Amino acid sequence: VRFAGFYKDNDGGKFFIKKPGDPRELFTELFAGLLLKEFMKRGLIDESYFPSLICADVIQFEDKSYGLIQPLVSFDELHKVIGQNKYFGLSMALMFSLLLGAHSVHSGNIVVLNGEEKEKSKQFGRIDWGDRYFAHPNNNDNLYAKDYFLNYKKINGLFPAMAEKARQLQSKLNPELLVKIVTSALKNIPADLIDEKTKIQLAAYMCMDSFKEATFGTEGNCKDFAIAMATLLENRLGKIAVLKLKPLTLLMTSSTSFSETINQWADILKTTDMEKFSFDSNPINLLELVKQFNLYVDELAITCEANNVWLFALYDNSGGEAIHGHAFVPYYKESIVLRRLFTVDPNTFNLSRFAAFEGPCQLYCKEHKDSAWVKIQTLLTLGNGIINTLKIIKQAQAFGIDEAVTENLKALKEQFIAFQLAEADIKEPNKESEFFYPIDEKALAKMNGYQLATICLEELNSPKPSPLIERILSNKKFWKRINSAFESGVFKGRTDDPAGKIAKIREWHQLLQIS
C-alpha cells in the first residue's frame, strides 16, 4: 500500500515503484535486475557485495500493466558527497556495469551506500550491444552507451581490481551454467510484459538476432536467445579478465607564503594551456596550503594593527542579546574580528562562524565600498575560495570525473587571476586587554550581562589573567548581570568549553570577594 510512489509491506519493508514510459526500458532494466539477482542467488558473489548491485524487480498493478519495484535504500548520490584509498563495492558495481553493457555510469548512477560501501543504481544494459568491441570502449565515442561521467582508467588501480573480480567470477562459471542463469532470469519475466513490436525493437536494439522468437513466462521457450546471451556474456567476461600529453600539477615549495604560491600557480596556469596537458591534483597539499593561508591571515591582521589603520560600533542592531554564544562588543579590535572571520579550520577546511559580527560588517561594506576592510575581505575570501575549489578538484578527480575537474579548474584560474588582481590594490597603548580596545569603567556600565560575559569569556583566551577581566569581576555591580547571563544558558552551545570557562570565572569572582 502506498504513500508518496513509496510503498509499504505489512510487517516490514519499504518500496519504490517507477512506471517507465518506454516499453523497452522496462524490459532492459528488469532483465538487468533479474540477471544480477540470479548471480547473487547462485552465490557466485559474496554476500558482502549484494548491496553493491541495486536493481529492480517487476510488479503487478490494478490496471494489469507492470511496474519497476525497487527496495528503498539509504544512499547519497556521488555528486552529493563531492559537492591509494579503498572503495568497497565499486569494482563489483563497475565490473558488472561493464559486463552487462551498462556504460553510462556517472555521478548520478554511482551512489554511496551508508559508510564504506559504494554502488550502482540504474541499469540499462544491452544497448546496441551485440556490436563496439573488442576494444571495449564506449566510454570514449560517447555511439553513446547533466550526466557527470566517471573514468575507469583514471580511478587508481580500478582495472586490475575489476579484472580480478572478473577472472574470479569466471573461475566459478561454465557455458551451461550461464545458460541456466539467463534462462532462469528470463522465466521470472511475465510472458505478458511487452507486446510483439517492441520485441523486434529490442532485437534491433541489443543487436541480437535470436530475440524476436522467444517468450518470457515460466511457461515459455527462450532457448536460442539463452544460448546467444550466455555465449556473449562469457566472451565479454573473458575479455574483461585481461584489461590493461604530459602531466601537470600545482606544487608548494619549501618556504613560501600563500600569495607567492598563488603566484607560481597563476603564471603556470596562465602560460600553459589545458589541451596539451593532463592536470593532476593528487600531489596537491591542501592542508599545508590552508596552514599557510591561516598564517597569511594572521600576518595581515598583525600588519593591519602595527600600522595604525582602522569600528562596527554604530552599525549594530542586535541590541544586547547574544547570538550564537556571542553578544556584540564594539571595543573588539578589527584585527581580532578579521581573524575570526577569515580563518580556516585546519583539517575540515571550512570557514568559522562569527554570527555576532556578520551583519555590522555587511552593512559598512556597503556604505564604505572603498574601505580597506572591504578590500581585505575581497582578498581573503578569494584565498579561501581557492582552497574550496581545490577541495572540489581533488575530490572529483578521486573518481575520474573529468568534467567537474575542468570546470573547477576554470573556476580555479578565474579565482587565481581575480586574487592577484585583487591583491595588488591592497597596497593601500593597550596592555589591559589582548582582544579589546582600551575601555574604562562607566563606558562599560552601559553594557549588559551578555556583552560583559562575552568579554569575560574572551579574556580567558589569555595565559595570564588580564587587567580587563579583573576590573570586571572585582565589581559587584556587574556580577548580577553577568551571572544572570551565565544562568540564561545562552553560552552553553559554544565551542571553547563554556562550562569550565564559566566555573573558572566563578572561582575568580569568588577569589575577589574575600577582601
DSSP label of 118 = E
d(Cα 336, Cα 48) in Å, to the nearest integer?
Answer: 52
Distance of alpha carbon 201 from the chain centroid:
40
Q: Exposed/middle/buried for 180, CB within 10 Å: 0-12, 13-18, 19+?
A: middle
Rounding to the nearest 10 degrees, give the CA dihedral for residues 339, 341, 342, 345. 90
* Rounded Cα–Cα distance for residues 384 and 422 (Å): 14
Q: Provide the 3-class DSSP secondary structure of residue 88.
A: coil
Whether residue 344 contacts residue 471, with contact meaning beta carbons closer than 8 Å, is answered with no
CB 375 within 8 A of CB 426: yes
Distances (CA, A) of 294 to 231, 349, 395: 61, 11, 22
| Cβ–Cβ < 8 Å for 214, 222 | yes
Contact 32, 41 (CB under 8 A): no
CB-based contact 281:390 (threshold 8 Å): yes
How far is it between the farthest Cα atoms of the chain?
103
> What is d(CA 341, CA 334) in angstroms, rounded to the nearest whole number?
10
> Are 204 and 198 a contacting pair, CB within 8 Å?
no
Evaluate whether 163 touches 92 at the Cβ level (below 8 Å).
Answer: no
Structural contact between residues 388 and 394, judged by C-beta atoms closer than 8 angstroms: no
Q: What gap in Å lies between CA 155 and CA 205, rounded to an integer? A: 30
- Look at residue 330 and give its three-state secondary structure: coil
Cell of 409: 579548474
Degrees, nearest 5: CA angle 253-259-262: 65
| Torsion (CA) 113, 117, 118, 119 in degrees, nearest 10 | -80
Cα–Cα distance for residue pair 193/201, rounded to 1 Å = 14
Solved using: X-ray
3-state helix, strand, coil in the chain (%, to 5): 45, 10, 45
Q: What's the distance, CA 210 to chain centroid?
A: 45
- Could you give the CA distance from residue 479 to residue 54 in angstroms, rounded to a whole number? 62
Q: In sequence order, what DSSP letters do the residues of 448-512 get, joined into one string? A: -HHHHHHHHHHHTTSSS--HHHHHHHT-HHHHHHHHHHHHHTTTTT-SS-HHHHHHHHHHHHHHT
Cα–Cα distance for residue pair 452/475, rounded to 1 Å: 12
Measure the CA–CA gap between 37 and 16, rounded to whole angstroms: 17
69: helix, coil or strand? Answer: strand
Indicate the pairing of strand 277-279 with strand 246-248.
parallel
Backbone φ, ψ for residue 372 (5° rounding): -65, -40
Name the pairing type of β-strands 2-3 and 6-8: antiparallel
Helical packing angle, 23-41 and 196-205, nearest 10°: 70
List the beta strands (DSSP E) in 299-418.
none
Contact of 124 with 104, CB cutoff 8 Å: yes
Residue 280, CA distances (Å) to 73, 341, 363, 396, 506 in order: 34, 31, 41, 11, 55
Q: What is the resolution of this structure in A?
A: 3.2
Query: Closest Cα to residue 58, out of 47, 49, 67, 48?
Result: 67
Please give the single-letter amino acid code of residue 445.
A
Question: How close are the terminal C-alpha atoms of the chain, in Å?
Answer: 76
